[PDB]
Design a protein around this ligand. Structure first.
Ligand SMILES: [Zn+2]
Lengths: 207, 88, 81, 118, 126, 50
RNA sequence: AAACUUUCAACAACGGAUCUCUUGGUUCUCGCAUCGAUGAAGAACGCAGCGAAAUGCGAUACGUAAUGUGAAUUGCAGAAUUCCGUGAAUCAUCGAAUCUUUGAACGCACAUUGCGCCCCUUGGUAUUCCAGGGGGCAUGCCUGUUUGAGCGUCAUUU
RNA sequence: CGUGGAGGUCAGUGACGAAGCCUAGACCGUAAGGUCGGGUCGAACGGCCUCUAGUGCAGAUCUUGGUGGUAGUAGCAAAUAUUCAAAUGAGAACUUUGAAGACUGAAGUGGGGAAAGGUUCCACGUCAACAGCAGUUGGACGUGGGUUAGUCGAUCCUAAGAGAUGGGGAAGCUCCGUUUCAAAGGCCUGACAGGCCACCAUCGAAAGGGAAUCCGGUUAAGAUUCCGGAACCUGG
RNA sequence: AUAUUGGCGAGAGACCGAUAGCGAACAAGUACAGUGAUGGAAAGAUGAAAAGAACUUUGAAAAGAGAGUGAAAAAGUACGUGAAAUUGUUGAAAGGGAAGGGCAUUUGAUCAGACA
RNA sequence: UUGACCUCAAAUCAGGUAGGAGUACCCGCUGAACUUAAGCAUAUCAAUAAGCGGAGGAAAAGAAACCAACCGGGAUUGC
C-alpha cells in the first residue's frame, strides 16, 4: 500500500537514557504505547522502497529481433543434438524434422490423437511427461503454481478442425499455428530445440 | 518537472489490454444489435488545411447539404440510409 | 494530590452516538455534532470515518438492496410449480 | 406444530380464539420453565403464535387491497417500496411522451434497415 | 481445462467454499458411489446419502464392515454407521466419522423423491 | 449517586448481565476456539465510563 | 581431596526462533448501478430450551409466512413422525409482512423513558370521572381547494 | 559463494521418513560456504543453465519479544498491641466464638448523606489465581436473592444565563438577536354579524421557591415507601 | 468513447506468509488509556477422529506413579517441529589476584580411511 | 349597499416534495504554509491538502459568436 505505517501517530521525544530518537507511538495502555514506528527497521513500520505499480513490468522488444529469434528457434529442430540435450527422448524415431499428414487436423478426438502420436514414436516423451508430475519447490503452491510437469512435444497445425480440442488436455502437449509460433512455447528457458511434429500443410505454408 | 507532489496523480495504462477486449465486445454487440447495418456511417473525402498537410485528404465529418441535393435526395433520408451530414 | 477534586463530569452520553462525549456547558457533542443535523465528517481524520461509517453495524435495510435489485424490485409471490 | 395453510381457510374469530388459547398455554409453560430445567415445546408455541398473527395481518391487507382496488391513492404502506429515486423519477409513459413535431419526424424519416452488397 | 470466466482455480477460494458451505450443498458434497450391482440395477453411478441407508465400507481400517446409518453429521462432513464404533475405556462407545466417498451402498431407503431423482439421473430402477 | 437516571440503570443492566463467564456447554461444540470470556469485566478493575 | 567457579556432551527446563501449512491481506483487471421522510447509515436496549461475545433478529424477536431443495439439527436435552411426504434443518432463495426507544427526526422538550392537544372505540355501577386500546398534531416550498383582509384599481347604491 | 521466488531441465529425492534442528563424529574447499554419518522430526524439497528481486549483519543511546548478573540482596520498620483455650478443618502468629488487655475518646477508627462508583449490599459453595507474608477468611471466584411511595426528591418556577421563530447578514458551514421594522394568539354573550382583551416562546437548581404523613413492627439485606393502626393535601 | 484507493458480484498473480502483509489471518477498529477530540494492540497450528486418559494406588487437592487409548505422548488443551541467550542433574577435566586467542607438542577421551 | 379583479394571508386543508448518511471518481466557492529560490521579499510548491456547498452511475462539456489564413477544416470528450 501507499500508507503502510502512515496509519500511526508517532513522533520522537528528544533525549533520554535507554531510548532512541526513533519516533514512538502516542497514547497509553495497549502495548503499542511507546513502541516505535516509522522506519525500515521497526515492527509494524513501513519499508524501504515501498514498492509501486509503476515499475517497468513489460519490456519492449524490436520486431526484427523477435522474428530473428523465432527463426533460429525453428532452425533448432533440424539438428536434433539440441533436442536430445534438452529432453525429448527421441532416439528411436528415424527422421527429423517430422512431417505428418494434413489429415491430422480433421481429428476430433484425444484418443485418436494420442494413438497417432504413439504410433509415430512420442510414447517416450508422453511417458516422460505424466511421470514427471512433481510438486513445486517453494511458496508457489499457494500462489496457484502448484504442480509442475516437464514439457512435451508441440503439434503444429496449419488450420484447426478439432486437433486443438483433442490436444487441449493431454499434458506436455501444446499446439500452435505457423503464424503465431509462440517463442515461449518453442524455446523455453532460452534452451532451443523443442520437439515438434509438423504437418504437410504447415510445412509448405512455412515457405 | 517533479518538484510538485506528482506521486498521487499517476495513470498507468495496465488496462490497455482489457479495454481492448471490452471495446471489441462493444463493437460486436452494437453490430449484432444493428445487425444488417455496417456499423459506420459513410464519411466523405476532404482535403486538409495547414499547407504542411494540404497534399493529403482526410475522412471528414459529413458530406454537405448541396452535394446531397446534387445526388438528388435529402439529408432527412440520408441519416436513415447510413450517410452523415455536416451543415456548417 | 490535585485529583481528589475530579468527580464533576463535563462529558456525558449522546443519544445518537453513544460515545460519552456530550459536553454540557455547551450542550453539544464533539463526535457527532448533536443537536446539529450534519454528522461530523472530517477528512483530516480517516480512522474516524472508518470507525463510524457504513458497514459497521446492523444495516437492517441496506444489506438487502443488492438482493432486491438483482431480482428486479418485484412484487408478488411464487407460482408453486 | 401449526401449519399456515390449515389457517388460511379459518375465520377471524377462530383465529383470535386459537391464538388466545396459545397465549394461555404459553403463560403456563413459562411457569413450568421455573420448575423444570427447560421446556422446548415453548418454541413450537411461540412460533405458532407468529404463524397465526402473520396470517391475520396478511388477510386484512388483502381485504383492504380489494377495498382500495382499481383506484388511485392507495395508502402508503401498500404502494410499492422500491426506492426513493425510482419513485421520484419518470415513468415509461412519461418518457415516451414526446412532442408532435418529433413524432412526425420519427414517423416520416425513421432509421431504415439497410446493408451493403448492392 | 477451465475455459470460462466465472469459476475459480484457486485454493483460497475453494477451501472457503467447501468449509463455509451450507448444509444444502454439503448434502451433495457428501455423495457416494453405489455398488456395481446397484449400478447395473439403477443405471447410475453415485448419489447423495441418507439416514436410512445400508452400506458397506471399502477403505480405511474398517474395511469389510457394513451396516446402516444412524446419523449424518454434515458439520464434520461425516457419517455414522452403527456396528462400527470404538469402545471407550469406560465401557461406553462412540460413533465413527467416515467420509461417504469411502463407502459403497448395497441397499437404500427409497422414497417418492428418490425414484424421481433416479429418473432425473437416468433411472433404470424397475 | 443513587438519584440515577433510567438510562444509567439501563446500561448497568447490560454490564450486570454481560458479567458472567462462559456457560460450560459451549466448551464442547465442534470447532470452537472461544475458551475464556475475554470481554468479561469487574468494577474496581475497569471503569465503564458510564 | 570434596564443595564452589569454568568449558563441553547427553538428558531435562525457561523461551518460542527456524521449517512446512494457511477460510486472511495487498495489487491489477473485468462487469453493474442499488441508501433515505413509505422514515436510511448509525447508536441503545432486549431476543435463543440450556449464551457472555461475533453472526442473525425485533415483544410475530439466532426468527414468521411463500417457493425450491427432499430427512435434518447436533455439545447436552428434547419435539421427533414430518418421513412414498402440502414436509426437517441455524439450508438456500426471498417477491408478503412485523420492525421496541431512538436517530435527518417530525406535537413541545430530551444529563428527564418528563409535559401536552385532537378524534373513534372498550372497560370499570357512571350524562360529568379514571384508565386502556387505535389513529393523528414538525418546518420551508409547489399546484389546487375552502375561508378571509386591505379603498389597492374598478362598475353599480341608500 | 549464499538466500526468497520464476522459465526450463535431472522421466531427480521423498513414509523403507522430505525440510528444519542438535552433534568436541568424518570429507571438501585458502575463504565465503558446501558435503556426509548418527539422534530428534513428520511432508515437502533440491542439483544444473538462465531470470527477477523487499537478497547476506556484531554494532545504529537501533526495533519487537525474551533472558541474565546484581540477589534469595535492598526491603516488607510511621500509624502505641496484642495474649490464652475450644470448634472448623489435613494445616492456624492471621478465620469464628468465648475470657482478659489496649485504642479511636464524640471538630471519632461511630451512624447517615451529596458528586462519583455501580451489584461492591445478603446468603450458600469454594481457593488456581488477587488481598505485595500465609489464609479454612474477604469488597476476590461461581451460583442466586434483594432496591416496593398520592405525602422524601426529580417533573413545576424563575435566577445570573444559554437559546428557537420573525427578520437581516454571511459565498457558505451556520451567524447577530430573544420580543424586537410580525396579519404570532382566544374568546364572551348575542342575532354570520357586532364587542373586549395583549402577552409573548421554551430550557436552566435532586442545596434556592414549593400542596400534604406519623408511630410501632418487619427482613439475610431496604423503609417518613411494605404490614398493623392512625391523619393529611389536591382534583372531582 | 474517458476517470474511479468508495460500494456490489466475479477472475487472476515472477506479491507478503504471522516482528512481513490492511492497524486486525483468531469474538478487531474488540479489549484498553484518555474528560474528550482522538489514540490503539498482543494473540494462528494437538491428532485423521478426543480416541481429551475410565480403572488401581499415594496424598487435602492440584498432581504424581502405575495401567490404558493411539502410528508416536520424544504431541496431555502449559499441546506440531521446539533452536539461542539463560538454568539444573549426571559424566570428564582444570583452577593460588583474571579469562578467552595464536605456533608446536605431551597426557586423557574420541574418530574416519586401507591392508585383500 | 352589493360585487368583479389585484395583492397578501391562515388552515392537523386534498395531493406532493427537500433535508441526512455516503463521498474513490465528478461541478463549483473560499484558499494557506512548510519546502524551493547558497540567503531574501514578487515567485514556486498551488489555482494543490484542509474547510463548505451539490449530484449521478458516470458527471461535466457539447452542435461554434471555433481553429484558421492552407485547394481551407468542422460539435464535444479522451489517447
Ligand atoms: Zn454523539
Amino acid at each position: 500500500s501507499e500508507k503502510a505505517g502512515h496509519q500511526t501517530s508517532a513522533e520522537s521525544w528528544g533525549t533520554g537514557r535507554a531510548v532512541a530518537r526513533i519516533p514512538r507511538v502516542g497514547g497509553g495502555g495497549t502495548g503499542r504505547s511507546g513502541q516505535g514506528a516509522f522506519g525500515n527497521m521497526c515492527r509494524g513500520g513501513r519499508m524501504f522502497a515501498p514498492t509501486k505499480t509503476w515499475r517497468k513490468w513489460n519490456v519492449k522488444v524490436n520486431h526484427n529481433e523477435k522474428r530473428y529469434a523465432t527463426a533460429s528457434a525453428i532452425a533448432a529442430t533440424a539438428v536434433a543434438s539440441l533436442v536430445l540435450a534438452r529432453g525429448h527422448r527421441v532416439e528411436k524415431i528415424p527422421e527429423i524434422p517430422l512431417v505428418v499428414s494434413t489429415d491430422l487436423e480433421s481429428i476430433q478426438k484425444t484418443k485418436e490423437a494420442v494413438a497417432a502420436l504413439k504410433a509415430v514414436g512420442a510414447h517416450s516423451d508422453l511417458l516422460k511427461v505424466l511421470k514427471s508430475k512433481k510438486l513445486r519447490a517453494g511458496k508457489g503452491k499457494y500462489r496457484n503454481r502448484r504442480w509442475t510437469q516437464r514439457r512435451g512435444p508441440l503439434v503444429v497445425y496449419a488450420e484447426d478442425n478439432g486437433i486443438v480440442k483433442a490436444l487441449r488436455n493431454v499434458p506436455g502437449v501444446e499446439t500452435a499455428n505457423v503464424a503465431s509460433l509462440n517463442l515461449l512455447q518453442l524455446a523455453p528457458g532460452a534452451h532451443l530445440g523443442r520437439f515438434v511434429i509438423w504437418t504437410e500443410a504447415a510445412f509448405t505454408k512455412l515457405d | 518537472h517533479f518538484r510538485k507532489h506528482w506521486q498521487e496523480r499517476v495513470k498507468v495504462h495496465f488496462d490497455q489490454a482489457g479495454k481492448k477486449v471490452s471495446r471489441r465486445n462493444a463493437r460486436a454487440t452494437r453490430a449484432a444489435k444493428i445487425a444488417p447495418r455496417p456499423l459506420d456511417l459513410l464519411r466523405p473525402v476532404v482535403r486538409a488545411p495547414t499547407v504542411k498537410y494540404n497534399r493529403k485528404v482526410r475522412a471528414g465529418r459529413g458530406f454537405t447539404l448541396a452535394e446531397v441535393k446534387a445526388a438528388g435526395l435529402t439529408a432527412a433520408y440520408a441519416r436513415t440510409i447510413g450517410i452523415a451530414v455536416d451543415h456548417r | 494530590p490535585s485529583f481528589g477534586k475530579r468527580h464533576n463530569k463535563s462529558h456525558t452520553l449522546c443519544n445518537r452516538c453513544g460515545r460519552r462525549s456530550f459536553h454540557v456547558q455547551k450542550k453539544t457533542c464533539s463526535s457527532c455534532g448533536y443537536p446539529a443535523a450534519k454528522t461530523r465528517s472530517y477528512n483530516w481524520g480517516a480512522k474516524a470515518k472508518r470507525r463510524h461509517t457504513t458497514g459497521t453495524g446492523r444495516m437492517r435495510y441496506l444489506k438487502h438492496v443488492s438482493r432486491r435489485f438483482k431480482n428486479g424490485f418485484q412484487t408478488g409471490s411464487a407460482s408453486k410449480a | 406444530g401449526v401449519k399456515a395453510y390449515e389457517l388460511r381457510t379459518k375465520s377471524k374469530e377462530q383465529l383470535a380464539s386459537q391464538l388466545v388459547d396459545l397465549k394461555k398455554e404459553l403463560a403456563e409453560l413459562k411457569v413450568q420453565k421455573l420448575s423444570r430445567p427447560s421446556l422446548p415445546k415453548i418454541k413450537t408455541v411461540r412460533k405458532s403464535i407468529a404463524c397465526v398473527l402473520t396470517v391475520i395481518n396478511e388477510q386484512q391487507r388483502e381485504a383492504v387491497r380489494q377495498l382500495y382496488k382499481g383506484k388511485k391513492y392507495q395508502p402508503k404502506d401498500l404502494r410499492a417500496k422500491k426506492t426513493r429515486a425510482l419513485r421520484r423519477a419518470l415513468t415509461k409513459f412519461e418518457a415516451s411522451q414526446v412532442t408532435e413535431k418529433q413524432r412526425k419526424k420519427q414517423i416520416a424519416f425513421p432509421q431504415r434497415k439497410y446493408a451493403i452488397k448492392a | 481445462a477451465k475455459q470460462s470466466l466465472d469459476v475459480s482455480s484457486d485454493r483460497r477460494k475453494a477451501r472457503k467454499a467447501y468449509f463455509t458451505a451450507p448444509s444444502s450443498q454439503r448434502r451433495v458434497l457428501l455423495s457416494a458411489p453405489l455398488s456395481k450391482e446397484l449400478r447395473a440395477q439403477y443405471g447410475i453411478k453415485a448419489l447423495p446419502i441418507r439416514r436410512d441407508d445400508e452400506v458397506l465400507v471399502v477403505r480405511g481400517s474398517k474395511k469389510g464392515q457394513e451396516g446402516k446409518i444412524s446419523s449424518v453429521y454434515r458439520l464434520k462432513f461425516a457419517v455414522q454407521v452403527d456396528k462400527v464404533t470404538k469402545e471407550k475405556v469406560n465401557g461406553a462407545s462412540v460413533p465413527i466419522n467416515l467420509h461417504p466417498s469411502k463407502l459403497v451402498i448395497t441397499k437404500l431407503h427409497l422414497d417418492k423423491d428418490r425414484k424421481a431423482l433416479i429418473q432425473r439421473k437416468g433411472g433404470k430402477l424397475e | 449517586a443513587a438519584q440515577k437516571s433510567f438510562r444509567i440503570k439501563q446500561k448497568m443492566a447490560k454490564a450486570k448481565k454481560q458479567n458472567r463467564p462462559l456457560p460450560q456447554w459451549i466448551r464442547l461444540r465442534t470447532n470452537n476456539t472461544i475458551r475464556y470470556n475475554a470481554k468479561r469485566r469487574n468494577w474496581r478493575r475497569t471503569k465503564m465510563n458510564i
